[PDB]
Homo-oligomer: 91 residues x 2
């Protein structure tokens, strides 16, 4: 099963570099939030998704998240072009 | 107008960091490939998507590729070496 992260662009960069299997980026515009809302409903229906990591802000923008025991849903606390030098030097 | 990339994690994180607007990861499992097929079909229907960059592997796994002129579909010539390197680089 897969580990998916949903959040803003910054948070997503880090988590992708850290090992998640799938990532979806969103900003706080109404349209983006609506898309994340539908995305979340979609991930809940996939039998190959076990863990969803979502930023506290996005979770609150979406609203009252579903009450399911599986997949596991974790909220990334609001604490977690500078990486431009790191990127170029790396690759 | 957006440029999208579809492929494995290493490729995806690299292209997103290189400027690509949207990126979607896929492995080679049947279910993941099937999700890629549907995603491709959806991207063709979006008005804000002009370019789709897809790894050579994934495109071949999908099989049939659209024959459209727009959006522009480009294959990327053919693992965690990239994510690992950027991670190690974070010795700040």
């Amino acid at each position: 099963m897969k580990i998916v992260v949903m959040g803003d662009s910054d948070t997503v960069v880090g988590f992708r570099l850290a090992g998640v299997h799938e990532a979806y980026e969103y900003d706080e515009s109404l349209e983006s939030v609506e898309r994340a809302r539908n995305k979340l409903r979609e991930l809940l229906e996939r039998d190959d998704v076990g863990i969803i990591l979502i930023t506290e802000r996005l979770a609150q923008r979406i609203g009252s998240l579903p009450e399911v025991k599986f997949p596991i849903i974790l909220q990334i606390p609001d604490k977690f072009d500078i990486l431009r030098d790191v990127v170029r030097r790396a690759i």
